[PDB]
Amino acid sequence: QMGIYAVMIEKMILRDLCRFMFVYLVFLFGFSTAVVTLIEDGKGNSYNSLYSTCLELFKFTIGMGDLEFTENYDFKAVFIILLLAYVILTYILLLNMLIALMGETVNKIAQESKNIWKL
Amino acid sequence: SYYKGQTALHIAIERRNMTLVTLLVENGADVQAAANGDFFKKTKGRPGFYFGELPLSLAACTNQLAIVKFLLQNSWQPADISARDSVGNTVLHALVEVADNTVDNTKFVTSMYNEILILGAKLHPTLKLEEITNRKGLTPLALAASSGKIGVLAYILQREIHEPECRHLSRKFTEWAYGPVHSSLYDLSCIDTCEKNSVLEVIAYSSSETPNRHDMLLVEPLNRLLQDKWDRFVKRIFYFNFFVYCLYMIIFTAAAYYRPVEGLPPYKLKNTVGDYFRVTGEILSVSGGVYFFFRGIQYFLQRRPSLKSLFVDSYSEILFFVQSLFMLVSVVLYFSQRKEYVASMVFSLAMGWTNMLYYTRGFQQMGIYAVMIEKMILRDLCRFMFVYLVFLFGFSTAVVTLIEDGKGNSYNSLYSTCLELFKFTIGMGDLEFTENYDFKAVFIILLLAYVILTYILLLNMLIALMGETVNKIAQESKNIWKLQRAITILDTEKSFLKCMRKAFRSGKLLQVGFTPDGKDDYRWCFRVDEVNWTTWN
Amino acid sequence: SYYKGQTALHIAIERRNMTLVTLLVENGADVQAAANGDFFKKTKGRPGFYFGELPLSLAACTNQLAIVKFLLQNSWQPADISARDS
Ligand SMILES: CC(C)(C)c1ccc(/C=C\C(=O)Nc2ccc3c(c2)OCCO3)cc1
Ligand code: NA
């Protein structure tokens, strides 16, 4: 029984997590680039770094996203629109995309996991 | 008047009475009678069905084999088979029109189709009855292609004949068979982009109104032709566009990230190398954006996409157009002394980086993923967003009505309440974000109702719906990806019209059989080997 | 050359004509003939299928029960069953 679980973990670390990670990396990189372009820091202040922005959006996907993590921008509307677009595209859409995809996987390949454990 | 186009002949056919029709035509009744009545027009919104003005068109549309046989073999006035009806359609065009996705319909409009081809060949061996075009200008292949008669299309594309004399009008030329191993050729007369409208082009550019559009491509000669070209000469070009787009987006990202912050645009041209690199990046980005804009306009004009549903068949084109628009408006505002260009630039950057997904159609697996993302951004996400917006707006209005701020103080704003409930949606909602209220019970009950209705009820409702969607439409995402690749390859091969054409051809010129005129058949075929262990004949 | 490995015997088998093959081998046609042609090689990326150089290998690869029976039971030159192909 635990063997089938390990087989599932392997199969879906080499089947689905790779693809979803590619696409999520594209989204996060694009939106992080956009946001960091928007920030100016011309006066919680060195958000500029792209790494920091990537980290904030990642916090967004793990349920610790701060929609007002920075107030140094110059168009609050643009910043909010970008963050909301990111949340809708990743948090509510892509994560649930992944959940749906993995449901499809397991539904198909329960027996496959069994046989791979036998092997 | 209505009762002038018709005659006793067509009605006698309608009853399917061979004796009645032959007796009627015995005295020498005209066979060229045309039923140019609105009741017989193709309009599907009105009663009646179009079967062709010539009565033979009616009979062929019907299963009256005897009537077509006798009319074509009658000693007097054998109605010409090659006839353009009012709409320019031939009895073959009418046949394909009458064809449906129904199996029995497929059987009828396939058997009769082949039979009539043979018969017309017999009467006129040297008549290109399968080439005549209607007013719309489509051959019967082009008709089944533009309409989507998957059965008639397949019948034409795999058409084989065993009679040596009339095998010329045949689509598939079997070559040999040494054991189950047996090659299979084809014709590719207009399959390839070598005609006014190539059935591949017709399928690719046809709107989503046509049914089974993505499903027709599965016909083996077409699908194998697609895969052959893709692996032969397009995949490399597609990867080259992917790589150049990556370089474009990286240059744009680098330029934006280093956009000057001091002073309204435009700026100046320092003597340092960094300034020069920055301007090079900016100008390269501008060039890319303007190219994308022009290409979007070109697609708009050439295709003139169905305005009713343009988001379901050109999603990527709209995305690229919008990103180009944002870049262009960044350019207009930039020179127009205003630091508001950064907004357009940022939207463009996000749009392009996210659009990188468009290239994921070249890969089997990631392509299905992108197709799913598009399908559920246009299918499930919009509906859920509407309902969630209703909930959030109502509850935000309620809460803001409740707040007073009559003394974490400027929360009266409806925007703040909407943001706070949204945080509730994304798992950062503070149940006591405000204490300027005056009824704790009311405030807490409202927040709890919102949480139950959205966070635990709706969001999970969307998860359930999306599970249903994927479970249903995995295969649909696969097929849509296939169609996306088909459009990709067609566009690529069209792109090099002036670059070159000789090497961009599929199939091989061959001469297998002979035409009744005692001449050779120079046809561009394409072999297909198959292994069948049972036929054995 | 390509047309040296093959013989009338293997083709006569290919048509599945028991009468033709038995007549051909009636005069004493060789049974050890080997079809060492690239067309018969095992490569799956090229046309053709490998069925074994010995014609009996072809017939067994085919469902020709009669041919295997006769050649194994023929009065003259029953092709040896134990044969290593190329
Ligand atoms: C540029 C901003 C930040 C305003 C923005 C633009 C679009 C979205 C949402 C979606 C999006 O851009 N979705 C998409 C775009 C292109 C694709 C694709 C999906 O998948 C199929 C291949 O190409 C969000 C924010
Ligand atoms: Na959470």
PDB file of N, CA and C and ligand atoms in Angstrom, chain A residues 27 31 34 78 81-86 88-89 93, chain B residues 315-317 319-320 322-323 326 344 346-361 367 369-371 373-375 377 484, ligand 1:
ATOM      1  N   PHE A  27       4.883  32.191 -15.761  1.00  0.00           N
ATOM      2  CA  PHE A  27       3.996  33.214 -15.209  1.00  0.00           C
ATOM      3  C   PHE A  27       4.709  34.050 -14.163  1.00  0.00           C
ATOM      4  N   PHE A  31       5.423  38.111 -14.465  1.00  0.00           N
ATOM      5  CA  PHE A  31       4.785  39.073 -13.578  1.00  0.00           C
ATOM      6  C   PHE A  31       5.785  39.706 -12.628  1.00  0.00           C
ATOM      7  N   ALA A  34       7.447  42.363 -14.671  1.00  0.00           N
ATOM      8  CA  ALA A  34       6.542  43.500 -14.775  1.00  0.00           C
ATOM      9  C   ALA A  34       6.559  44.325 -13.497  1.00  0.00           C
ATOM     10  N   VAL A  78      -2.034  50.199 -11.409  1.00  0.00           N
ATOM     11  CA  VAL A  78      -1.296  49.234 -12.218  1.00  0.00           C
ATOM     12  C   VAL A  78      -0.767  48.108 -11.340  1.00  0.00           C
ATOM     13  N   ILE A  81      -3.623  45.870 -10.276  1.00  0.00           N
ATOM     14  CA  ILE A  81      -4.110  45.077 -11.397  1.00  0.00           C
ATOM     15  C   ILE A  81      -3.154  43.933 -11.686  1.00  0.00           C
ATOM     16  N   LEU A  82      -1.849  44.202 -11.649  1.00  0.00           N
ATOM     17  CA  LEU A  82      -0.876  43.144 -11.902  1.00  0.00           C
ATOM     18  C   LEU A  82      -0.959  42.059 -10.839  1.00  0.00           C
ATOM     19  N   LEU A  83      -1.020  42.456  -9.565  1.00  0.00           N
ATOM     20  CA  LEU A  83      -1.092  41.461  -8.500  1.00  0.00           C
ATOM     21  C   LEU A  83      -2.368  40.641  -8.606  1.00  0.00           C
ATOM     22  N   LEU A  84      -3.491  41.291  -8.905  1.00  0.00           N
ATOM     23  CA  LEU A  84      -4.748  40.566  -9.020  1.00  0.00           C
ATOM     24  C   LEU A  84      -4.729  39.633 -10.218  1.00  0.00           C
ATOM     25  N   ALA A  85      -4.148  40.074 -11.332  1.00  0.00           N
ATOM     26  CA  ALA A  85      -4.018  39.195 -12.482  1.00  0.00           C
ATOM     27  C   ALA A  85      -3.169  37.984 -12.135  1.00  0.00           C
ATOM     28  N   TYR A  86      -2.066  38.200 -11.418  1.00  0.00           N
ATOM     29  CA  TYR A  86      -1.221  37.086 -11.013  1.00  0.00           C
ATOM     30  C   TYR A  86      -1.988  36.121 -10.126  1.00  0.00           C
ATOM     31  N   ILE A  88      -5.257  35.617  -9.903  1.00  0.00           N
ATOM     32  CA  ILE A  88      -6.292  34.909 -10.645  1.00  0.00           C
ATOM     33  C   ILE A  88      -5.669  33.855 -11.549  1.00  0.00           C
ATOM     34  N   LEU A  89      -4.549  34.185 -12.191  1.00  0.00           N
ATOM     35  CA  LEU A  89      -3.963  33.268 -13.160  1.00  0.00           C
ATOM     36  C   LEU A  89      -3.269  32.097 -12.476  1.00  0.00           C
ATOM     37  N   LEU A  93      -6.410  29.798 -10.530  1.00  0.00           N
ATOM     38  CA  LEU A  93      -6.521  29.106 -11.807  1.00  0.00           C
ATOM     39  C   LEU A  93      -5.496  27.987 -11.950  1.00  0.00           C
TER      40      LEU A  93
ATOM     41  N   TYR B 315      -7.271  33.179 -29.939  1.00  0.00           N
ATOM     42  CA  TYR B 315      -6.937  33.725 -28.629  1.00  0.00           C
ATOM     43  C   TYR B 315      -5.516  34.285 -28.652  1.00  0.00           C
ATOM     44  N   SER B 316      -4.570  33.493 -29.162  1.00  0.00           N
ATOM     45  CA  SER B 316      -3.173  33.906 -29.175  1.00  0.00           C
ATOM     46  C   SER B 316      -2.976  35.154 -30.017  1.00  0.00           C
ATOM     47  N   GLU B 317      -3.681  35.245 -31.144  1.00  0.00           N
ATOM     48  CA  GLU B 317      -3.543  36.417 -31.995  1.00  0.00           C
ATOM     49  C   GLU B 317      -4.024  37.665 -31.273  1.00  0.00           C
ATOM     50  N   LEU B 319      -4.017  38.090 -28.043  1.00  0.00           N
ATOM     51  CA  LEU B 319      -3.031  38.393 -27.010  1.00  0.00           C
ATOM     52  C   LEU B 319      -1.846  39.148 -27.590  1.00  0.00           C
ATOM     53  N   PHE B 320      -1.304  38.654 -28.702  1.00  0.00           N
ATOM     54  CA  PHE B 320      -0.167  39.326 -29.314  1.00  0.00           C
ATOM     55  C   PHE B 320      -0.554  40.726 -29.760  1.00  0.00           C
ATOM     56  N   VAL B 322      -2.798  42.671 -28.433  1.00  0.00           N
ATOM     57  CA  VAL B 322      -2.949  43.537 -27.270  1.00  0.00           C
ATOM     58  C   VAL B 322      -1.589  43.936 -26.721  1.00  0.00           C
ATOM     59  N   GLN B 323      -0.655  42.988 -26.654  1.00  0.00           N
ATOM     60  CA  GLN B 323       0.685  43.329 -26.188  1.00  0.00           C
ATOM     61  C   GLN B 323       1.328  44.355 -27.110  1.00  0.00           C
ATOM     62  N   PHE B 326      -0.132  47.715 -26.384  1.00  0.00           N
ATOM     63  CA  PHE B 326       0.430  48.313 -25.179  1.00  0.00           C
ATOM     64  C   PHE B 326       1.819  48.875 -25.448  1.00  0.00           C
ATOM     65  N   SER B 344       1.774  51.072 -19.659  1.00  0.00           N
ATOM     66  CA  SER B 344       1.600  50.307 -20.884  1.00  0.00           C
ATOM     67  C   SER B 344       2.760  49.347 -21.093  1.00  0.00           C
ATOM     68  N   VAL B 346       4.624  47.929 -18.848  1.00  0.00           N
ATOM     69  CA  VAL B 346       4.548  46.836 -17.888  1.00  0.00           C
ATOM     70  C   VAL B 346       3.469  45.846 -18.294  1.00  0.00           C
ATOM     71  N   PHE B 347       2.306  46.348 -18.702  1.00  0.00           N
ATOM     72  CA  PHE B 347       1.271  45.447 -19.189  1.00  0.00           C
ATOM     73  C   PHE B 347       1.781  44.644 -20.374  1.00  0.00           C
ATOM     74  N   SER B 348       2.508  45.296 -21.283  1.00  0.00           N
ATOM     75  CA  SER B 348       3.047  44.598 -22.445  1.00  0.00           C
ATOM     76  C   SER B 348       4.032  43.516 -22.030  1.00  0.00           C
ATOM     77  N   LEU B 349       4.902  43.827 -21.072  1.00  0.00           N
ATOM     78  CA  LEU B 349       5.893  42.859 -20.615  1.00  0.00           C
ATOM     79  C   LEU B 349       5.218  41.635 -20.021  1.00  0.00           C
ATOM     80  N   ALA B 350       4.258  41.858 -19.128  1.00  0.00           N
ATOM     81  CA  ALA B 350       3.541  40.738 -18.540  1.00  0.00           C
ATOM     82  C   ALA B 350       2.844  39.928 -19.618  1.00  0.00           C
ATOM     83  N   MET B 351       2.188  40.612 -20.556  1.00  0.00           N
ATOM     84  CA  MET B 351       1.456  39.909 -21.597  1.00  0.00           C
ATOM     85  C   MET B 351       2.384  39.044 -22.433  1.00  0.00           C
ATOM     86  N   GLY B 352       3.545  39.572 -22.821  1.00  0.00           N
ATOM     87  CA  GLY B 352       4.451  38.799 -23.658  1.00  0.00           C
ATOM     88  C   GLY B 352       5.056  37.614 -22.930  1.00  0.00           C
ATOM     89  N   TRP B 353       5.533  37.841 -21.705  1.00  0.00           N
ATOM     90  CA  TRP B 353       6.095  36.730 -20.951  1.00  0.00           C
ATOM     91  C   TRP B 353       5.058  35.638 -20.769  1.00  0.00           C
ATOM     92  N   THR B 354       3.813  36.017 -20.490  1.00  0.00           N
ATOM     93  CA  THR B 354       2.759  35.026 -20.366  1.00  0.00           C
ATOM     94  C   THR B 354       2.412  34.397 -21.706  1.00  0.00           C
ATOM     95  N   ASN B 355       2.566  35.137 -22.800  1.00  0.00           N
ATOM     96  CA  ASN B 355       2.274  34.626 -24.129  1.00  0.00           C
ATOM     97  C   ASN B 355       3.295  33.618 -24.601  1.00  0.00           C
ATOM     98  N   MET B 356       4.477  33.597 -23.989  1.00  0.00           N
ATOM     99  CA  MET B 356       5.423  32.531 -24.305  1.00  0.00           C
ATOM    100  C   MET B 356       4.742  31.171 -24.360  1.00  0.00           C
ATOM    101  N   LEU B 357       3.622  31.002 -23.662  1.00  0.00           N
ATOM    102  CA  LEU B 357       2.885  29.751 -23.725  1.00  0.00           C
ATOM    103  C   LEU B 357       2.435  29.415 -25.136  1.00  0.00           C
ATOM    104  N   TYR B 358       2.303  30.411 -26.012  1.00  0.00           N
ATOM    105  CA  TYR B 358       1.814  30.135 -27.359  1.00  0.00           C
ATOM    106  C   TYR B 358       2.706  29.135 -28.072  1.00  0.00           C
ATOM    107  N   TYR B 359       4.005  29.177 -27.796  1.00  0.00           N
ATOM    108  CA  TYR B 359       4.948  28.281 -28.443  1.00  0.00           C
ATOM    109  C   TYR B 359       4.881  26.866 -27.899  1.00  0.00           C
ATOM    110  N   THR B 360       4.166  26.665 -26.833  1.00  0.00           N
ATOM    111  CA  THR B 360       4.133  25.365 -26.197  1.00  0.00           C
ATOM    112  C   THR B 360       3.310  24.419 -27.035  1.00  0.00           C
ATOM    113  N   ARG B 361       2.743  24.851 -28.156  1.00  0.00           N
ATOM    114  CA  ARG B 361       2.021  23.958 -29.048  1.00  0.00           C
ATOM    115  C   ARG B 361       2.944  23.042 -29.834  1.00  0.00           C
ATOM    116  N   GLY B 367       1.700  21.422 -24.729  1.00  0.00           N
ATOM    117  CA  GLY B 367       0.662  21.995 -25.566  1.00  0.00           C
ATOM    118  C   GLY B 367      -0.731  21.694 -25.054  1.00  0.00           C
ATOM    119  N   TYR B 369      -1.457  21.274 -22.074  1.00  0.00           N
ATOM    120  CA  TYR B 369      -1.597  22.080 -20.871  1.00  0.00           C
ATOM    121  C   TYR B 369      -2.019  23.501 -21.218  1.00  0.00           C
ATOM    122  N   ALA B 370      -1.380  24.092 -22.229  1.00  0.00           N
ATOM    123  CA  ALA B 370      -1.759  25.437 -22.648  1.00  0.00           C
ATOM    124  C   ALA B 370      -3.177  25.457 -23.199  1.00  0.00           C
ATOM    125  N   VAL B 371      -3.564  24.408 -23.923  1.00  0.00           N
ATOM    126  CA  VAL B 371      -4.922  24.339 -24.449  1.00  0.00           C
ATOM    127  C   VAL B 371      -5.923  24.305 -23.308  1.00  0.00           C
ATOM    128  N   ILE B 373      -5.440  25.556 -20.336  1.00  0.00           N
ATOM    129  CA  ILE B 373      -5.449  26.869 -19.696  1.00  0.00           C
ATOM    130  C   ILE B 373      -6.348  27.824 -20.466  1.00  0.00           C
ATOM    131  N   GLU B 374      -6.218  27.849 -21.792  1.00  0.00           N
ATOM    132  CA  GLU B 374      -7.078  28.722 -22.591  1.00  0.00           C
ATOM    133  C   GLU B 374      -8.543  28.317 -22.471  1.00  0.00           C
ATOM    134  N   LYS B 375      -8.822  27.020 -22.593  1.00  0.00           N
ATOM    135  CA  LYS B 375     -10.199  26.557 -22.586  1.00  0.00           C
ATOM    136  C   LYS B 375     -10.886  26.917 -21.284  1.00  0.00           C
ATOM    137  N   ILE B 377      -9.844  29.358 -19.193  1.00  0.00           N
ATOM    138  CA  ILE B 377      -9.922  30.797 -19.004  1.00  0.00           C
ATOM    139  C   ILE B 377     -11.101  31.366 -19.770  1.00  0.00           C
ATOM    140  N   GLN B 484      -3.940  23.355 -33.456  1.00  0.00           N
ATOM    141  CA  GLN B 484      -3.045  24.491 -33.312  1.00  0.00           C
ATOM    142  C   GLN B 484      -1.752  24.247 -34.072  1.00  0.00           C
TER     143      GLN B 484
HETATM  144  C1  LIG D   1      -0.548  42.085 -19.071  1.00  0.00           C
HETATM  145  C2  LIG D   1      -1.488  41.862 -17.862  1.00  0.00           C
HETATM  146  C3  LIG D   1      -0.675  41.858 -16.548  1.00  0.00           C
HETATM  147  C4  LIG D   1      -2.553  42.978 -17.805  1.00  0.00           C
HETATM  148  C5  LIG D   1      -2.211  40.504 -18.010  1.00  0.00           C
HETATM  149  C6  LIG D   1      -2.484  39.975 -19.266  1.00  0.00           C
HETATM  150  C7  LIG D   1      -3.142  38.755 -19.388  1.00  0.00           C
HETATM  151  C8  LIG D   1      -3.513  38.076 -18.239  1.00  0.00           C
HETATM  152  C9  LIG D   1      -4.261  36.733 -18.296  1.00  0.00           C
HETATM  153  C10 LIG D   1      -3.894  35.910 -19.262  1.00  0.00           C
HETATM  154  C11 LIG D   1      -3.074  35.469 -20.470  1.00  0.00           C
HETATM  155  O1  LIG D   1      -2.284  36.218 -20.921  1.00  0.00           O
HETATM  156  N1  LIG D   1      -3.318  34.124 -20.992  1.00  0.00           N
HETATM  157  C12 LIG D   1      -2.653  33.513 -22.145  1.00  0.00           C
HETATM  158  C13 LIG D   1      -2.007  34.278 -23.141  1.00  0.00           C
HETATM  159  C14 LIG D   1      -1.397  33.660 -24.239  1.00  0.00           C
HETATM  160  C15 LIG D   1      -1.447  32.244 -24.354  1.00  0.00           C
HETATM  161  C16 LIG D   1      -2.086  31.491 -23.383  1.00  0.00           C
HETATM  162  C17 LIG D   1      -2.704  32.122 -22.267  1.00  0.00           C
HETATM  163  O2  LIG D   1      -2.139  30.077 -23.502  1.00  0.00           O
HETATM  164  C18 LIG D   1      -2.201  29.709 -24.842  1.00  0.00           C
HETATM  165  C19 LIG D   1      -1.019  30.261 -25.626  1.00  0.00           C
HETATM  166  O3  LIG D   1      -0.820  31.639 -25.485  1.00  0.00           O
HETATM  167  C20 LIG D   1      -3.246  38.613 -16.984  1.00  0.00           C
HETATM  168  C21 LIG D   1      -2.592  39.831 -16.865  1.00  0.00           C
END
